[PDB]
Curated annotation (Swiss-Prot):
Gene giving rise to this polypeptide: BRD1
Subunit structure: Component of some HBO1 complex composed of KAT7/HBO1, MEAF6, ING4 and BRD1/BRPF2. Component of the MOZ/MORF complex composed at least of ING5, KAT6A, KAT6B, MEAF6 and one of BRPF1, BRD1/BRPF2 and BRPF3. Interacts (via PHD-type zinc finger domain) with unmodified histone H3. Interacts (via PWWP domain) with dimethylated and trimethylated 'Lys-79' on histone H3.
Subcellular location: Nucleus; Chromosome
Domain of life: Eukaryota
Positions bearing the Glycyl lysine isopeptide (Lys-Gly) (interchain with G-Cter in SUMO2) cross-link: K41
Tissues/organs with expression: Highly expressed in testis.
Function: Scaffold subunit of various histone acetyltransferase (HAT) complexes, such as the MOZ/MORF and HBO1 complexes, that acts as a regulator of hematopoiesis. Plays a key role in HBO1 complex by directing KAT7/HBO1 specificity towards histone H3 'Lys-14' acetylation (H3K14ac), thereby promoting erythroid differentiation.
Name used for this protein in its record: Bromodomain-containing protein 1
Residues of the full protein shown: 555 to 674 of 1058
Domain Bromo positions: 9-113
Amino acid sequence: SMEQVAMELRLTELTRLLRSVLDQLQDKDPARIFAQPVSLKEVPDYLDHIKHPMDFATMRKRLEAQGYKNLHEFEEDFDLIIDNCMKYNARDTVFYRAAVRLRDQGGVVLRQARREVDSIG
Ligand code: NA
């Protein structure tokens, strides 16, 4: 049907907007602390602490599989990156401090992407 194609043109457009958003969020992690999953060879107990790990490459794979159905799902994954890090690491660590900075700086980007997703439909 033509109705499923017009849908898929929009999902494709949403994928295109979210790709831009992701690149801007990741530019706020120049240390690349959140780039890749936490290593289970290096932190073997990690899953005892964190039930839903998340990182930027894992979000990218989902994105390129058009697996985000809306901005809310994308944001949830971004928040997991931050919240996991803030639980697993103590307050006086470079890791915790990096997540605080990413949250604060990411807010500006997510605020404008909310408006662009509503505006464009
Ligand atoms: Na903690």
